[PDB]
């Protein structure tokens, strides 16, 4: 068996749970067959038995590093099926917290990558910044992560009176924090070695294996679903996709540090130009009525009672809506009968495709190389296992 | 608009510059300077028991059932808190109290089943079930985590003052 | 520069009443700092807030012995703080 | 701040000087206030031994012109 050796489920190196049954001739990897489902939990079947609004919390758990960006994909999908679109302020919010979430994911991906490599100080440096961001989530949603803030018809509640100012102070400084990590890793005489020319993926092969993420962008293919197919108001902002050449672990990394930088450019704008308005559609049909209204107006109570107890009652149809979640293209194919509860909801996980590529990326590579490549794919087993 | 993250003569000055970088580990020394710098920064940690990480009014935390100032428990067993709970956590069975009013004989939130979504906070018309601020309710035994009406009502009485302040701060938003 | 810290360090140490206060506070918290006393709740507890310190540590509570007769001097717990003063400690409300 | 890493170090330092001062005074006590002779080569051991025979049994005792 060429000394087949399970990478093992319990391994600090393996994010979450990954059995990589690997046959290694000494320290060289001949074949990697990743095993999955150590975190399958039924998210796709469970949703069929739940109403649209009570299936929103499942999406936050699908890939919870990127808590909200995932929620936006279901939102968009349910809004399309209803042909309803969120109010202008809600759109900007979703882009505001959409980006904050991208940073959160990249701080996770870059710093956790280093911890497996062996650099441990970048993680503590940026987890403090993460922490500060979580607090935004909490003061907007109530939960540090797993908010449930972005609902199918807009966000749930307007921003607290004062958040924008703090999402500024932080943004005004975060840059230096990214800069520091840099002085520690971008040019380390050693980061480069373990990362450069490891897991190079061709451009044609990346499209073929459905990579669709930084992994494509790192190989030089220019595709950001946020510029190619704008969703929400990511069209009204101006940002630069960080394309890469000589795609390899180091190049893609540089790309993830660059989108952390570009997201600060998008966040700034959102703070500078967020409109006065409502944060949820005015159709009591889709969005729950305000509590003052349901406690004084009969039509609002009836709409509150029916919405919470039964549901949206989406018109029959099916849609595949994909956003640019921090990992890559996150899409929900939501088939829907006229009923208030969905019929199918295949979650396309940027990650099911990326893991598959582990085999075609880590060939003739050492045990340490495999650890570096799992990092450069930002694998969150929640999205892959669903 | 796109950007090239890493897209790219040999002069003694240049080479000598590059060779010194490899020979005397110049960039490695650069990295050491950064960590020495923070060693001098104030640490961000908080004494956990003595100082607590800040949570604003919407923090969901631990379930509680409120009561009217008079002393009549708010819940009127409409049971849509049960309907919208995503995890099937809340179990409610009711019967008309002798007063003739409508009250819940049994209200059981299984906290291990609950995923603290906060929709129950949302759904209640009388707002009887609220997400209370406390997050520290870790328990030695699994049974303690299952909560009946008496624990939640008792939880409600203990934290009513802060729950009232929290709802006071956030109701305009809702 | 260093002169001031040496001086102000003495203030903190000599601030806790007698030798015992320091040795006590030192052992149960491991942090010595001086702040205005915002309030003392009926369950034995003392609360201090310092504007100068960063957001995480500007409000702290020094727990007291036997707040329900439990020998809590060593085994201090967070829940000991009363529900009324819990939100002040967690910065939920900036009003003591 | 960083003030606190010092306590621990102090107890390391103090525990790394003891040995050097200790070995270098348990020598100047056992050898009569004179550094223990280092006999790298035999000549030195000879001279040392010669000293032993010259007085008492211990080499550290050292007879002088008045003998």
């Amino acid at each position: 068996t060429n000394m087949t050796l399970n990478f093992g489920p319990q391994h600090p190196a393996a994010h979450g749970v990954l059995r990589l049954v690997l046959e290694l001739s000494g320290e060289m990897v001949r074949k990697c067959d990743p095993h999955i489902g150590l975190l399958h939990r039924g998210t796709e079947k469970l949703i069929e038995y739940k109403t649209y609004l009570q299936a929103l919390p499942y999406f936050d758990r699908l890939d919870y590093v990127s808590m909200m960006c995932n929620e936006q994909a279901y939102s968009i999908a349910v809004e399309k099926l209803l042909n309803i679109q969120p109010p202008p302020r809600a759109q900007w919010i979703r882009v505001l917290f959409g980006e904050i979430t991208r940073i959160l994911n990249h701080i996770m991906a870059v710093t956790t990558h280093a911890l497996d490599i062996g650099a441990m100080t970048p993680f503590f440096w940026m987890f403090e910044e993460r922490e500060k961001m979580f607090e935004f989530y909490e003061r907007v949603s109530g939960a540090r992560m797993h908010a449930a803030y972005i609902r199918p018809g807009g966000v749930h509640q307007d921003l607290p009176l004062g958040l924008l100012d703090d999402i500024y102070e932080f943004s005004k400084n975060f840059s230096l924090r990214i800069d520091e990590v840099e002085e520690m890793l971008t040019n380390n005489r050693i980061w480069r070695n373990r990362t450069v020319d490891i897991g190079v993926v061709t451009a044609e092969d990346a499209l073929n294996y459905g990579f669709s993420g930084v992994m494509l962008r790192g190989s030089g293919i220019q595709w950001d679903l946020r510029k190619t197919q704008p969703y929400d108001v990511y069209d009204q902002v101006e940002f630069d996709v960080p394309i890469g050449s000589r795609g390899d672990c180091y190049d893609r990394y540089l790309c993830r540090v660059e989108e952390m930088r570009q997201s600060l450019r998008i966040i700034e704008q959102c703070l500078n130009k967020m409109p006065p308005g409502e944060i949820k559609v005015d159709d009591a049909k889709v969005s729950p009525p305000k509590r003052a209204e349901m406690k004084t107006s009969m039509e609002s109570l009836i709409h509150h009672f029916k919405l919470y107890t039964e549901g949206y009652q989406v018109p029959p149809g099916a849609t595949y809506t994909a956003i640019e979640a921090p990992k890559g293209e996150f899409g929900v194919y939501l088939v829907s009968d006229g009923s208030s509860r969905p019929y199918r909801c295949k979650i396309k996980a940027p990650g099911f495709a990326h893991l598959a590529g582990l085999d075609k990326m880590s060939k003739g590579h050492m045990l340490a190389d495999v650890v570096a490549i799992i990092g450069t794919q930002d694998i969150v087993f929640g999205e892959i296992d669903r | 608009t796109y950007k090239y993250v890493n897209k790219k003569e040999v002069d003694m000055k240049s080479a000598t510059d590059n060779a010194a970088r490899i020979l005397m580990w110049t960039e490695l020394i650069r990295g050491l300077g950064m960590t020495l710098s923070y060693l001098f920064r104030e640490p961000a940690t908080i004494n956990y028991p003595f100082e607590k990480g800040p949570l604003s009014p919407r923090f969901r935390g631990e379930h509680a059932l409120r009561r009217y100032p008079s002393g009549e428990e708010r819940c009127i067993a409409c049971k849509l808190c049960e309907a919208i709970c995503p995890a099937q956590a809340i179990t409610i069975e009711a019967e008309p109290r002798a007063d003739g009013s409508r009250r819940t004989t049994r209200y059981d939130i299984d906290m291990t089943k609950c995923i603290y979504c906060g929709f129950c906070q949302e759904a209640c018309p009388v707002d009887a079930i609220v997400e209370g601020p406390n997050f520290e309710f870790s328990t030695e035994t699994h049974e303690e985590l299952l909560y009946n009406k008496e624990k939640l009502l008792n939880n409600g009485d203990k934290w009513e003052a802060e729950i009232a302040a929290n709802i006071q701060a956030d109701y305009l938003y809702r | 520069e260093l002169v001031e810290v040496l001086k102000r360090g003495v203030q903190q140490v000599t601030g806790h009443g007698g030798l015992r206060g320091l040795l006590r506070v030192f052992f149960r918290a491991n942090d010595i700092r001086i702040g205005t006393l915002v309030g003392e709740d009926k369950y034995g507890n003392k609360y201090y807030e310092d504007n100068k310190q960063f957001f995480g540590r500007h409000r702290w509570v020094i727990y007291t012995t036997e707040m329900n007769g439990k020998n809590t001097f060593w085994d201090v717990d967070g829940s000991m703080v009363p529900p009324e003063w819990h939100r002040w400690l967690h910065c939920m409300t900036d009003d003591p | 701040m960083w003030f606190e890493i010092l306590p621990g170090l102090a107890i390391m330092g103090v525990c790394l000087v003891i040995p050097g001062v200790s070995t270098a005074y348990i020598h100047k006590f056992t050898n009569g206030g004179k550094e223990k002779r280092v006999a790298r080569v035999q000549y030195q051991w000879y001279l040392m031994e010669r000293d032993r025979r010259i007085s008492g049994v211990n080499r550290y005792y050292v007879s002088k012109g008045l003998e």
Partner: peptide, 27 residues
């Protein structure tokens, strides 16, 4: 809140001004 000397050791070792973008959030 750190002596300028110690603070300098920081700026020098870092190569940029952390004073402008501090780790301690304040009012």
């Amino acid at each position: 809140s750190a002596t300028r000397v110690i603070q300098k050791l920081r700026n020098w070792a870092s190569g940029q001004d952390l004073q402008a973008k501090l780790q301690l959030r304040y009012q």
